[PDB]
Design a protein around this ligand. Structure first.
Ligand SMILES: NC(=O)c1ccc[n+]([C@@H]2O[C@H](COP(=O)([O-])OP(=O)(O)OC[C@H]3O[C@@H](n4cnc5c(N)ncnc54)[C@H](OP(=O)(O)O)[C@@H]3O)[C@@H](O)[C@H]2O)c1
Ligand SMILES: NC(=O)c1ccc[n+]([C@@H]2O[C@H](COP(=O)([O-])OP(=O)(O)OC[C@H]3O[C@@H](n4cnc5c(N)ncnc54)[C@H](OP(=O)(O)O)[C@@H]3O)[C@@H](O)[C@H]2O)c1
Ligand SMILES: [K+]
Ligand SMILES: [K+]
Ligand SMILES: [K+]
Ligand SMILES: [K+]
Ligand SMILES: [K+]
Ligand SMILES: [K+]
Ligand SMILES: [K+]
Ligand SMILES: [K+]
Ligand SMILES: [K+]
Ligand SMILES: [K+]
Ligand SMILES: [Zn+2]
Ligand SMILES: [Zn+2]
Lengths: 357, 357
């Protein structure tokens, strides 16, 4: 079968061939329908070959997949079921408490592999296997855009943990501010619009000039576009208002620090970004005191698990049809896959189509 | 009646006289038994006269009080009841959502007064009044050390909110690290020893040379003393172990930042300290990435409310008798009150006694 992989020495993804996998006990064989591309994929392409699976000369890309079960093997899944796989699998040392307790999304570095990212081949191949316990059935009609279930799930987990931090008091937020206009930030903004918390005023940070299709999505959602070149995060309360909830999706370290200043009293910031080391002058006194005197929280989150993928299916049904149309700027057949890895301002979310149902 | 107050121009607390207060509807009159002194009191003494009550030339000190109800007025309290008052009262603008929803401990700056601290006279007077809703009955036998119920309550709230942040997953911590060896930190360390979470390994940060009575308390609790001059917070994982729970009670901004590096994956730091502005070089990239990749949280907390004061009574019963004996280094009669404000290394927790039961 064909697969899309990064190799040592190649700067871009390429097509390779390798045998179709055969399912082990407890696993099903899945025919890949579509696999999404996000910032994480570009980071893997830009990175080294450290994340390659032990003793292998490539890494098959892709962690946002939807497929059809073609062999349920000894599982309780059925032939023709539409499924989305979770990303984390046990490391070389085998199982551990995080996998045994069904919370591998909480495992620390070294205690998991992430398919398509670190230690294990991804899903950009014509077929893949996975344990049934890591295959989430989704509605048949979500097959077309089923590659969005994993990114939605990332936000579902982050909101779960951020909202948990506020659960000791009666928190009823009205304003929310997403930092970042990449596919995760824009998906998150639409999710916040329909969130059961009932946010009234939405904001999204970017650094684009008009005309720009991310600005257009932000504004079409009735949110306010905040250009960080004009209004830094710390100035947002003055220019706009204090934000009860902040979701950081830029990977820009200054936003982690300054979010505390933009939060309303009793607010929380969820942190999703994965920055490199970067040192500069910080008023740590102001950071520290504001957290305490106004009962604020910062919560970091990574990955997601089965309940979040299930929650994503319900949230998907509530997203506007225009928004899903505008978010997904290109679905590319495997025959012309390269354009899925385009990285310019008019590319928001892309996927590669391996097969149709 | 006599009261202990700070005045404009006096560097130290002094004795004043003012009329006994009369209870308004919904309030009881309380005879003060003992009032504790903590770092907050020293900060008020060191500060300006901005926190003085509107149009008054002094501020009566003290926010950690225990007294006996002498006139229940139109309340459901009884004559002879032992009570501890909460600290926050409505500001000049009157009631607001935080008071109406019984969560004034979540009110932001300007939307509360704190008795003995900002905007309202404290409890270091022979008598005081308070709404019955802000008087917490405690066991009669806690009268002697009833001034410890408010500080215990501060920790009860902070733990409630920090633990809430971890409630979306199965968190079962084993290590805890209190930063600070002042009365709040040492009380907190003893509380963590008996916490229902079942911590196995305890640590407390200070910067004292032996012999020192805070080191002795730390070690007598079977905790490890971490001298920050030897081992900075960021080095603690290497020298000791990663800490599932960190409670910051130093008011030192570097500890807010570095706590993230000392936390175990999935851990939380509670922040209690109230630092002034202070800017210096911070690796914000490392801070940000570690929060995210290891699902960590920082939660700030201030004040406390009725449920936390009730919880404190139960926790008090579990604290070792030797620990309560060693923590309280001096109870001073009003006749010789000045020594309660001693601020040297051998002074841990003090109180002033206004009357006996
Ligand atoms: N924690 C997790 O489980 C998880 C999962 C998925 C993704 N992530 C992380 O989430 C972040 C977002 O991912 P994505 O797929 O949306 O990535 P992305 O496509 O790279 O989007 C990041 C966006 O943030 C904008 N941005 C960066 N710095 C900015 C600044 N200073 N001011 C205003 N805008 C700024 C960028 O705008 P420009 O193009 O104009 O520069 C870009 O559009 C990444 O850091 C990624 O690694 C984490
Ligand atoms: N958020 C709230 O509701 C609330 C309530 C009460 C108190 N507080 C805050 O909690 C903090 C503790 O209060 P407290 O009554 O315990 O105050 P404290 O008596 O002043 O104690 C602070 C302790 O921290 C130690 N310390 C300071 N910097 C240090 C460092 N770099 N390394 C090691 N030890 C260090 C000090 O040691 P040395 O004496 O050796 O310098 C001191 O013993 C204060 O900042 C206070 O304002 C907040
Ligand atoms: K709302
Ligand atoms: K404003
Ligand atoms: K939802
Ligand atoms: K783009
Ligand atoms: K650019
Ligand atoms: K435990
Ligand atoms: K170690
Ligand atoms: K307890
Ligand atoms: K002292
Ligand atoms: K000293
Ligand atoms: Zn992705
Ligand atoms: Zn106090």
């Amino acid at each position: 079968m064909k697969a899309i992989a990064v190799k040592r020495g190649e700067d871009r993804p390429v097509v390779i061939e390798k045998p179709r996998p055969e399912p082990e006990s407890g696993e099903a064989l899945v025919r890949t329908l579509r696999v999404g591309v996000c910032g994480t994929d570009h980071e893997v392409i830009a990175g080294g070959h450290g994340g390659f699976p032990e003793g292998e000369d490539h890494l098959v890309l892709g962690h946002e997949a939807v497929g059809v079960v073609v062999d349920p093997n000894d599982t309780e899944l059925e032939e023709g079921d539409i499924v989305v796989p979770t990303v984390r699998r046990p490391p070389a040392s085998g199982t551990n408490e995080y996998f045994e307790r069904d919370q591998p999304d909480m495992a620390p570095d070294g205690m998991y592999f992430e398919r398509g990212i670190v230690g294990a081949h991804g899903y950009m191949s014509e077929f893949f296997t996975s344990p049934e316990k890591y295959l989430v059935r989704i509605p048949r009609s979500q097959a077309e855009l089923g590659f969005l279930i994993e990114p939605i799930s990332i936000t579902e987990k982050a909101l779960e943990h951020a909202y948990a931090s506020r659960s000791a008091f009666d928190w009823d937020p009205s304003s929310a501010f997403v930092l970042g206009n990449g596919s995760l930030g824009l998906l998150t903004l639409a999710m916040l619009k329909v969130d059961d918390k009932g946010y009234e005023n939405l904001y999204c940070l970017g650094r684009r000039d008009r005309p720009d299709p991310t600005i257009d999505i932000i504004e079409e959602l009735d949110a306010t576009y905040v250009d960080s070149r004009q209004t830094p995060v710390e100035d947002v309360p003055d220019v706009y208002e204090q934000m009860d909830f902040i979701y950081e999706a830029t990977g820009f370290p200054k936003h982690a620090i300054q979010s505390v200043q933009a939060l309303a009293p009793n607010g929380v910031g969820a942190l999703l970004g994965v920055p490199s080391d970067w040192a500069f002058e910080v008023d740590a006194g102001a950071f520290h005191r504001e957290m305490v005197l106004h009962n604020k929280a910062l919560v970091g989150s990574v990955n997601s698990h089965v309940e979040h993928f299930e929650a994503a299916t319900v949230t998907f049904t509530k997203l506007p049809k225009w928004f899903l149309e505008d978010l997904v700027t290109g679905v590319h057949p495997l025959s012309e896959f390269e354009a899925a890895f385009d990285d310019d301002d008019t590319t928001i979310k892309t996927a590669i189509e391996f097969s149709t149902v």
